[PDB]
RNA sequence: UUGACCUCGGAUCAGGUAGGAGGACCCGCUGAACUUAAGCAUAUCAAUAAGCGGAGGAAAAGAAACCAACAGGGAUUGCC
RNA sequence: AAGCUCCUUCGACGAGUCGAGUAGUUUGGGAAUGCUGCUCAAAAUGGGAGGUAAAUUUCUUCUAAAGCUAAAUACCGGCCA
RNA sequence: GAUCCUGAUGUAUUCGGAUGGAUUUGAGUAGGAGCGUUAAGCCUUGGACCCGAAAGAUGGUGAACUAU
């Protein structure tokens, strides 16, 4: 069961324009990438490969929208005096350096 | 006890921004302060840390109001030292 | 699974738990009319009557807690509207 | 205007985060990173599973939203993710596991709440013709539109979607920015982390015609019922041989 | 795995007999009280309910009422002269049904029933 | 009948402000001449002083 | 009839009749006593169905009973402290069941009804003479009542393991060591 | 003027009843700490001991808003 | 007085209770394991709990908020042996 | 059994592993050894070979202060 003319039909009913002749990358703000992730990761057990291909996939689709949302001119960089509210709390990120902190000390007090 | 700078600590991105952070064993820019205004804007921020707690609220809001001024000057005159080298 | 001969069981009053006494309808509209309606019922009503039907039944949802609670509640004061139209 | 965009062009899209009644504590946090990383949505407590799956749709016109998500939990144990286009088409099931939510001291990334993202996706979401229908409505689900009076200033964080085995896999991170040696860009994981497998695709808000089965779903009640009845056997095979072995001496 | 206090919390069987001889004693006095009568009443049997015991049978609580009419027997009687009446359980087999028909004919076959006075 | 995603007066989000901040304290932005950014990218000044 | 068209009209209670009527019995109850005699039932559809009879031996105490917390919350309802005091009160009666009446906002008002077993109209109708036996002494002390059950979760199903059967017993059970003769 | 009904009282009015003791086991309320382990903290001791209220020869529970996915079981209780 | 059978007649079932939000407490048990307090507050081809990806939320199984009841079970106290 | 391949008739057009392999792994197969119990020894938990530290908690009994 994989009717490809309805799936495209349903396609052709909600495909919002993204030409990128009429439509801006400011608009949409969604890049694919030219290469397949599964052809770079070998066995899906292995997790550090499996998450490098991921992160490359992703840093690909940030090194693109940056480089056309620079060019549009819209504020990409985060300036250092404007503090808002992240999704992550400050007592979240509080105890993420924390268990660093113990991680790394740990580590220098075997050494020690 | 142990400085999270001798620790290979990364920074972490909170309310307050990371900014663009600078690479570990390089050359980080030195940026001299040397105008007026920026050494005002300095003084001004350690003479509000070293007076602290001001009873009156008006005179809170007045070394704040000082702050904020010395931070503004400053901003102006970068900008016309931009506008300068820009055109001129 | 194993093959048995299937059979019809007899009906069960105790599934017929679900009333359809009419005299027990007739007894609650008689006394929905006695009594009249809640404050927030009224409210309810005020909406439905001037046209607010979506808000009414966010109001009855936050009042009630389930939306197929709001969406009976909603019906049964429809109802009673419509009914309010024909006696009048 | 009532649509809260200040644009050109207007994408008027509303977002209705939905959670079922079975949903565990992992599931609702997972909800609630979706809802915070989602401005134009709304977010709503448990849905009857006695109701109707286009009720939801009557839900979804209630609150004024053209996109639903919805959770729906199976045993406590099991997700399952509904992304629909109400009133009119089209949706798709997900089975949802390998959970991985947010408040998980692990990850060392953040972004600001609302931002824009970039939609990261595939090769493979280009190409199988199914793929591309998920991209759309991922891309309708976690647009964030361009003049929305709730999204931040200033982008930080990437979405990205990635087809690996038979399975979507969800990512998110932080664009940190450093500068270059005599800026470059990495990224650090900063949010929830989970797998997706295709169902089905109907045509229609919550029914309709199928027209993508997936054929190869692996159902952890199938898996469940396996053990079951391996137990059972192990049983059974050895009342057989205690029939045998009494046989056997009479014999 | 002595965490808590088992010594304050500690029993011992050493009433094993005494309790077996109290037992057989009550099931000679319950005899004795319905001296020509069994001293058990009759029970259906019935198949164990999950898929690893469904092929064997058991003894169940009562017998059901269509089993108990098909065979015969009122209900009111049933549990007077010793059958007991399970009015939760439903057939839902011709199996069973029959099955538990045999049984309570071989019990009225079996029976005898003394005319009231 | 296809839905237009509008946000009702009885909406929570219908008035939004312009500061484009969120929960977090005003304690930050007190020693500074600005208030937030608006949506566009643009700090926010201070009105004036009383 | 009127046992139904009184049992809507209950469960209709913020309707305008009844919350004229709660109202002004609300006043009226702050007025009278903490505890005092009924008369009759102020609710007789609710009373009958717990098992009020108008018989010599059955009687009605209205209770006011203070509402709120100990952050510490006490495991016994309010109900069940209005059934103690009603209990403590006519010591030489039997709590048979309470009912609610009026909330206000400060106190929540209880009718219980109880039963006299030393009367000779309960004592040879059967149906009560349970109650006059002595096994039910102050079952409103021991949890005996609806709300004691209630409260001690005496209910058959997956979720009720651990206080089915009696909570202590159950723990103790499952805290003995069993060793046998033979082991 | 009189007489009912309702409500609230009085009596050393007629007849009854409660208290206290006991508490081995039983039903509830309330409720620790010593100890053990772990960077720390939750946890453990223990839903225990102490305190309070209430019964009996047993108490409690108890005749499914139960178990189940069966070819079905069929109140409660206790042992393996 | 009572039981069955038949039917061109009927068939009544527990509300500040479920339930939603929340605080405490408790459990192996956030489908909140149960309980309590607090604010809101229900239904009648109804409600509760499970099963299920199977295409819609189908199927399965019971009737809560009224009550009584011996036995198998516990016992360092009572009358004894 | 498991992992990385090599890729057969064919099949529902997307379903499978056969042959040949690998500096691989098993607490593997390779013609069963376990169960019950007696005696001795060791480990853990209970008071734990015996005696002995300051403490904390629950519930009670009493008094000691030109302070009035």
């Known amino acids: 069961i994989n009717n490809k003319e309805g799936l495209l039909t349903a396609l052709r009913r909600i495909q919002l324009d993204i030409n990128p002749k009429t439509t801006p990358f400011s608009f949409h703000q969604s890049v694919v990438a030219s290469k397949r992730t599964e052809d770079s990761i070998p066995q899906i057990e292995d997790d550090l490969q499996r998450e490098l291909a991921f992160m490359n996939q992703a840093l690909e689709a940030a090194r693109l929208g940056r480089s056309l949302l620079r060019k549009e001119g819209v504020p990409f960089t985060r300036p250092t005096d404007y503090f808002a509210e992240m999704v992550r709390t400050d007592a979240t990120m509080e105890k993420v350096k924390q268990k660093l902190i113990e991680e790394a000390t740990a580590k220098k007090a075997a050494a020690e | 006890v142990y400085s999270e700078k001798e620790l290979g600590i990364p920074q972490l991105n909170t309310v307050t921004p990371v900014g663009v952070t600078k690479p570990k064993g390089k050359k980080k820019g030195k940026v001299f302060v040397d105008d007026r205004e920026s050494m005002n804007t300095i003084l001004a921020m350690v003479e509000a840390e070293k007076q602290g707690q001001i009873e009156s609220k008006i005179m809170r809001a007045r070394q704040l109001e000082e702050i904020r001024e010395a931070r503004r000057i400053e901003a102006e005159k970068k900008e016309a030292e931009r506008k300068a080298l820009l055109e001129n | 699974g194993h093959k048995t001969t299937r059979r019809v069981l007899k009906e069960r009053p105790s599934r017929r738990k679900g009333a359809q006494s009419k005299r027990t309808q007739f007894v609650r509209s008689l006394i929905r009319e006695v009594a ?45 509207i419509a009914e309010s139209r024909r006696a009048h | 205007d009532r649509s809260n965009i200040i644009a050109e062009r207007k994408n008027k899209q509303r977002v209705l985060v939905l959670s079922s009644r079975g949903v565990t504590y992992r599931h609702r946090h997972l909800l609630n990173d979706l809802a915070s990383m989602l401005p134009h949505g709304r977010k709503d407590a448990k849905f009857d599973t006695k109701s109707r799956l286009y009720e939801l749709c009557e839900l979804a016109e209630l609150y004024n939203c053209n996109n639903v998500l919805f959770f729906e939990a199976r045993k406590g144990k099991d997700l399952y993710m509904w992304f629909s286009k109400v009133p009119n088409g089209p949706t798709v099931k997900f089975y949802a596991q390998n959970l991985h939510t947010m408040e998980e001291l692990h990850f060392q990334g953040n972004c600001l709440k609302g931002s824009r993202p970039i939609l990261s996706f595939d090769a493979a979401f280009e190409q199988e013709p199914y793929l591309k229908v998920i991209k759309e409505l ?87 019922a396996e053990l079951r009845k391996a137990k059972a056997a192990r049983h059974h095979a050895r009342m057989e041989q205690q029939r045998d072995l009494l046989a056997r001496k009479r014999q | 795995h002595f965490r808590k206090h088992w010594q304050r919390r500690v029993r011992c069987h050493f009433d094993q007999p005494g309790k077996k001889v109290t037992r057989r004693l009550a099931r000679r006095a319950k005899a004795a009280a319905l001296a020509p009568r069994p001293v058990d009443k009759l029970r259906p049997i019935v198949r164990c309910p999950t898929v690893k015991y469904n092929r064997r049978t058991r003894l169940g609580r009562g017998f059901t009422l269509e089993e108990l009419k098909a065979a015969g027997i009122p209900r009111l009687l049933a549990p007077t002269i010793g059958i007991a009446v399970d009015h939760r359980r439903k057939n839902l087999s011709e199996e069973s049904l029959a099955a538990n028909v045999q049984r309570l004919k071989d019990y009225k076959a079996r029976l005898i029933l003394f005319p009231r006075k | 009948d296809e839905i237009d995603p509008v946000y009702d007066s009885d909406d929570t989000d219908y008035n939004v402000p312009v500061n484009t901040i969120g929960n977090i304290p005003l304690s930050f932005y007190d020693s500074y001449p600005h208030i937030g950014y608006d949506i566009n990218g643009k700090k926010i000044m201070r009105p004036a002083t009383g | 009839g009127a046992l139904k068209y009184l049992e809507e009209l209950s469960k209709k209670k913020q309707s305008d009749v009844v919350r004229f009527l709660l109202r002004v019995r609300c006043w009226e109850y702050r007025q009278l006593n903490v505890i005092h005699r009924a008369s009759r039932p102020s609710r007789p559809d609710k009373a009958r169905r717990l098992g009020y009879k108008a018989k010599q031996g059955y009687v009605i105490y209205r209770v006011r009973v203070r509402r709120g917390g100990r952050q510490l919350k006490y495991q016994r309802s309010l109900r069940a402290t209005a059934e103690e005091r009603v209990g403590r009160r006519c010591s030489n009666l039997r709590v048979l069941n309470s009912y609610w009446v009026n909330q206000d906002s400060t106190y929540k008002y209880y009718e219980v009804i109880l039963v006299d077993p030393n009367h000779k109209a309960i004592r040879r109708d059967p149906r009560i003479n349970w109650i006059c036996n002595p096994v039910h002494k102050h079952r409103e002390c021991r949890g005996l009542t609806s709300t004691g059950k209630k409260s001690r979760g005496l209910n058959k199903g997956h979720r009720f393991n651990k206080t089915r059967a009696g909570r202590r017993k159950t723990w103790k059970r499952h805290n003995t060591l069993s060793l046998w003769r033979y082991r």
């Open chain 3, 36 to 80: 009249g309606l809640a404050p927030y019922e009224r409210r309810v009503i005020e909406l439905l009557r001037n046209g607010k039907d979506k808000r009414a039944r966010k109001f009855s949802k936050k009042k009630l807690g389930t939306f197929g609670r709001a969406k009976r509640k909603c019906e049964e004061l429809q109802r009673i």
């Open chain 4, 138 to 224: 991922f891309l309708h689900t976690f647009g964030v539109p361009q003049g929305h009076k709730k999204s931040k200033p200033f982008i930080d964080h990437v979405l990205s979607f990635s087809v690996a085995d038979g399975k979507i896999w969800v990512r998110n991170y932080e664009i940190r920015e450093v500068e270059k040696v005599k800026t470059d860009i990495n990224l650090i994981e900063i949010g929830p982390r989970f797998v997706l497998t295709p169902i089905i695709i109907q045509e229609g808000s919550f029914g309709g015609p199928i027209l993508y089965e997936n054929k190869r779903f692996i159902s952890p009640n199938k898996i469940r």
